[PDB]
């Protein structure tokens, strides 16, 4: 009566976009993993291979092999895909970081940013334009972005994404967005993204990555439903959690997640940060909703039935 029985179906009937997950190239012969993203998941994210350094190594040369991957994958699949990551500090090439004449490096990122968007055009509906550019305390993070350009590196790469493909919504992405008291939350995005809405920046959603801790660490996602209204206050139309995964993947912890974009007008949709924890970038945290033997965990189970 709604789809197969499993997760994003039942989310999407709730009124929801997407309930995705994260898998690359070298997951694609991996027929445990694919038929789970096919039955159980509606979205994918690159977890590498559309990252800076993978995408354009030495200046305009573009290797589009592993990101072409899948997204043929996904698109045969009927998976929406979240495009992941325009403009980022980390897995930078050496090249870029070179270049502190302000025209070079607001060319450069254009290239990238026209190159990347068109290539991919109408089959990307979330593009993380920025990811990662604050500080904990709420300034621009230092970067040869930050440094160069200051804050406007953001409107350079907005406004070229915008024009290259006007259907995908353009995204600002981090982490430690957790609390709703933090200063990253108050003074970094919510202030900034103000700021930059303000100015005519084409920033429809913010992405909150939600890499969170055990019940009883640092950002525990006891507190994730105030700190992600917090965020859906911004002046933005949208909000989505992007890398989702909670060490632990205790049922309740991943209840309150859902729940609280549920519970949110403006948040579109969820992605966990990959399938099963035997491939996770913390795998000791054992935080996905699959587990070694790429069977459904508690957590899985526990939001299939609040559907």
Same mark, same amino acid.
């Given at each position: 009566?709604?789809?197969?029985?499993?997760?994003?179906?039942?989310?999407?009937?709730?009124?929801?976009?997407?309930?995705?997950?994260?898998?690359?190239? &070298?997951?694609?012969?991996?027929?445990?993993?694919?038929?789970?993203?096919?039955?159980?998941?509606?979205?994918?994210?690159?977890?590498?291979?559309?990252?800076?350094?993978?995408?354009?190594?030495?200046?305009?040369?573009?290797?589009?092999?592993?990101?072409?991957?899948?997204?043929?994958?996904?698109?045969?699949?009927?998976?929406?895909?979240?495009?992941?990551?325009?403009?980022?500090?980390?897995?930078?090439?050496?090249?870029?970081?070179?270049?502190?004449?302000?025209?070079?490096?607001?060319?450069?990122?254009?290239?990238?940013?026209?190159?990347?968007?068109?290539? $991919?055009?109408?089959?990307?509906?979330?593009?993380?334009?920025?990811?990662?550019?604050?500080?904990?305390?709420?300034?621009?993070?230092?970067?040869?972005?930050?440094?160069?350009?200051?804050?406007?590196?953001?409107?350079?790469?907005?406004?070229?994404?915008?024009?290259?493909?006007?259907?995908?919504?353009? $995204?600002?992405?981090? $982490?430690?967005?957790?609390?709703?008291? $933090?200063?990253?939350?108050?003074?970094?995005?919510?202030?900034? #993204?103000?700021?930059?809405?303000?100015?005519?920046?084409?920033?429809?959603?913010?992405?909150?990555?939600?890499?969170?801790?055990?019940?009883?660490?640092?950002?525990?996602?006891?507190?994730?439903?105030?700190?992600?209204?917090?965020?859906?206050?911004?002046?933005?139309?949208?909000?989505?959690?992007?890398?989702?995964?909670?060490?632990?993947?205790?049922?309740?912890?991943?209840?309150?997640?859902?729940?609280?974009?549920?519970?949110?007008?403006?948040? #579109?949709?969820?992605?966990?940060?990959?399938?099963?924890?035997?491939?996770?970038?913390?795998?000791?945290?054992?935080?996905?909703?699959?587990?070694?033997? &790429?069977?459904?965990?508690?957590? &899985?189970?526990?939001? #299939?039935?609040?559907?």
């Amino acid at each position: 009566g709604t789809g197969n029985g499993e997760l994003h179906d039942k989310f999407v009937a709730k009124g929801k976009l997407f309930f995705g997950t994260e898998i690359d190239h &070298y997951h694609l012969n991996n027929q445990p993993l694919t038929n789970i993203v096919k039955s159980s998941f509606g979205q994918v994210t690159h977890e590498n291979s559309m990252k800076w350094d993978a995408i354009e190594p030495s200046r305009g040369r573009f290797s589009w092999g592993n990101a072409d991957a899948v997204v043929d994958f996904a698109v045969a699949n009927g998976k929406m895909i979240r495009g992941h990551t325009l403009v980022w500090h980390s897995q930078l090439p050496d090249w870029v970081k070179q270049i502190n004449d302000r025209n070079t490096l607001t060319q450069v990122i254009e290239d990238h940013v026209t190159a990347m968007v068109t290539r $991919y055009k109408g089959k990307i509906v979330h593009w993380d334009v920025v990811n990662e550019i604050f500080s904990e305390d709420g300034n621009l993070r230092d970067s040869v972005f930050s440094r160069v350009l200051g804050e406007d590196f953001v409107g350079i790469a907005f406004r070229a994404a915008r024009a290259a493909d006007p259907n995908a919504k353009l $995204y600002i992405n981090d $982490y430690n967005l957790d609390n709703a008291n $933090y200063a990253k939350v108050t003074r970094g995005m919510v202030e900034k #993204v103000n700021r930059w809405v303000s100015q005519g920046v084409p920033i429809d959603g913010i992405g909150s990555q939600c890499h969170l801790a055990a019940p009883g660490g640092w950002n525990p996602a006891s507190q994730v439903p105030g700190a992600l209204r917090a965020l859906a206050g911004a002046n933005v139309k949208e909000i989505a959690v992007t890398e989702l995964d909670i060490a632990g993947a205790a049922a309740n912890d991943y209840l309150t997640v859902m729940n609280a974009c549920l519970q949110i007008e403006k948040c #579109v949709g969820i992605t966990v940060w990959g399938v099963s924890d035997k491939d996770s970038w913390r795998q000791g945290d054992n935080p996905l909703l699959f587990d070694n033997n &790429y069977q459904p965990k508690a957590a &899985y189970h526990a939001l #299939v039935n609040a559907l």
